[PDB]
């Protein structure tokens, strides 16, 4: 016997009413009419502020065709794996009848990235005046070279709206008297829009999905990559770099820790006649790399020093004013290490010879972890990590003890006026060090955290990060698609009326269209995915 | 001017092709036919194992009508706010022609919870034999007393399948020779099924949604409520209780910390001529309750002791064998406190009189936090927390220092053989202490963690939890609906072939249909939401 | 043997999707043949492509 | 409680109480302790023990 997809004998149940009755009762109270109701109404998309300052050429809107534009389509598309068809877009302009000015509408073919310039108007285009009343509906046709689209495709037709003729106001007093009118954009799926093949519930996607959730909605959720503190600033460098918790669009990592902040479980060795301060780490419980423990800080001491017992000691030229800083003043032998509380617990042999148990009865102490070279007399900085260069510093034991501990990064032994990991030479590599250079008009950036120091009341220093923590987790555990020649763009909007575009390249680093972002930024920031653009295209921004 | 929902003038764009052409190309390569394809095929639901052991009366399947049954309907339902109509269910039985036996199909009205008993067959019912071939399709009609359904409704019609006549096999050798055949259940939305009113994208739900995601899919993600370790066992008590990170279905908490594990930021005071070990906490940076710091452990010391300097010291009758334990052996003055690493940093007055800076140049030390009474000479246990009873223990300072720190719970000072928080009297209340008692045949349970101690090599003790951490976060930040008389049920399935039902009551505590769960349980467990049942109904289980 | 029991489900997974060993895959259109088959079942695999 | 809940330790029925007492050797006292009980709702406390 063969059972088809709907095959089966239907049996009637005794306690069952007449469907038609209840059916209409529903339709009646509910008002149900059509099925894909979203086909019968325009849904908000975005809005445009056309001011009298924007001159001829300025692009005020550039959207590419894609089911994502419509919240409804976007949701349904999740069940399917194919799409095709266009999407209608409605612009509703509302300016004074006294105004003057005209916008231009272009339809750019697929496979060609439009540039912002008047020369764009040397292409067939439609105009609509500022005093336009009834909304205009432009249909973005699905010009494609394939039989249908894949959920991962993004190179489609594009509708661009640009300033044709400057906005004018007869009452315009001058330049410092900007005037502006709004334009609201809405979408409605076109008659020929269609989702195609359904995909089995648990199946996986052979070609990753579009990266639209790599940067959380509110900066309130922007934890760091290096440190766990909440991001509170940016840094536009001509060259960004990092290797630990940094993750690739291919879900690969040159690091030794996962995209999470978990406690560190090491094991310290202590023999007699050895060192009584700096210790070597042996084995580990939780680790991604066979030897190096998950989470182990990716930084090393600035200069070489001897394994001498010491404590905090910063010159007077520090937190007593706004003076400068001299690398000589700070003489904290364990400068540069990462401060992290712990839970100590030494082992006891069946024949406790020395006063071991005496140590096992001692209160655990905060260690000062780090990665460096150790020859029992000197501690030299080594950025090439290995299951050997793992050293901790504190009071420690003396006899032949095998003390195991559980660390938890909390602070950092201050060193200079410069942020943590701002120097390549000091960043713990491991084989290779990922990096992202300036690309024409896009400069890479570092996400600035705030790590705690260890002597100055409750002060802290700035810590650099290669990517928001969520960005790392998603690139890690996810499967995203992005053509190397391009980058996933996001709109960062300030708590005021300031904003700038951030683009993530295939490697995993974020870029910006500026060579330096402003300091004054009401940080309760917000983000919104824009789409995928080319790297050789300067990113947008309305700062200053 | 008034613009309707689709109003707008359509303008034709110059560079645009003929839609009809590309349209068909799609339809042709894609095979697109109907729109709600899920209306044309049965989708897997669940399966039933009918063995020759199950006797007349046993219910093998009891599903209530609800769009959630169908993965497709379930997804679409998210756009809407109303539903109504039935759903077809297909049973496909496959047993040997040599078998014998019959199952019964009932249709229970809404508003009546069926009980498992033969007396159920004294109700109209349909039978299908074990050697049935072609699948049978039962339609669950939507019998309702309202005009339509709300996404939060759950009290609908119910289809029950029960053993009518024991399964038989002529080759059945005996009792220890169980035989069994499979039955697979599938669903297909009925002709009259309909989603009704759409809901504005950002709007909120006035009546919370059904609790179907309160317990994660894999136990690998089951972190604790009290401790952050991964759950690894259960404990069926005649009375469960907790108050800290425990959350209510109303998103309320009688605790003082949020559903997350974040570092603790306190402030210790130290004056001359005071105590040199146990210290009082002053202010705090991060806290939910105005005075008590977020995360502060919810346990207190067992007995009263004097503020004397001490260290770990457990009798020999501990970790040297499998002996018992005497509360006299353990003389660790700070028994019961929570071990947690920290980052110390004392303040410096503009006129450092005493040797303050001398302290500011000292390596931070692990503190032993806890909640208790303090009169500088004696430390008595007090379960009624307040911004006063916050005391820490360690070496600390002596002069007039205002030392601020940042804690991080890592361990626990062992005390007895019993798990943490297993005693009401010791659990830090605050005004009231939530609890859940046995309910006829359902006994409340505790989720068992594994917290680290502080002296025994790398050993640990069991820690109790009132709810999986995710459960807490969701009840916290979410909006779920559940009639107090009922409880959200979940199927916990062992890595072998063992399983038991867990029901969460409105208060937030989980229950079980047994008075004691087995120890041997391959813990890579899995969970799957079953629905909402009454509390006066013993939960299912196939253990032993 | 004609005395056995059991069903086997067949399904076509479109391109760009990797199947997994889960019953979830059955929450998709599928036909099924029985262990006690008489005459062979022929499934014809369509060539779904965008080229 | 209205939901069959009881903060107590005994059932809504009056049934006999069964306990075990500890006989003291090195002492002459009249008050004895109870080791354990056989029938109980709450492990440890006998069902029906006075209020």
Curated annotation (Swiss-Prot), chains A, B:
The record's subcellular locations are:
Virion; Host cytoplasm
| Domain of life the protein comes from | Viruses
The protein's name is Mature capsid protein
Curated annotation (Swiss-Prot), chain D:
Transmembrane feature ranges: none
Q: Where in the cell is it found?
A: Virion; Host cytoplasm
This protein is called: Mature capsid protein
- Protein's organism: San Miguel sea lion virus serotype 4 (SMSV-4)
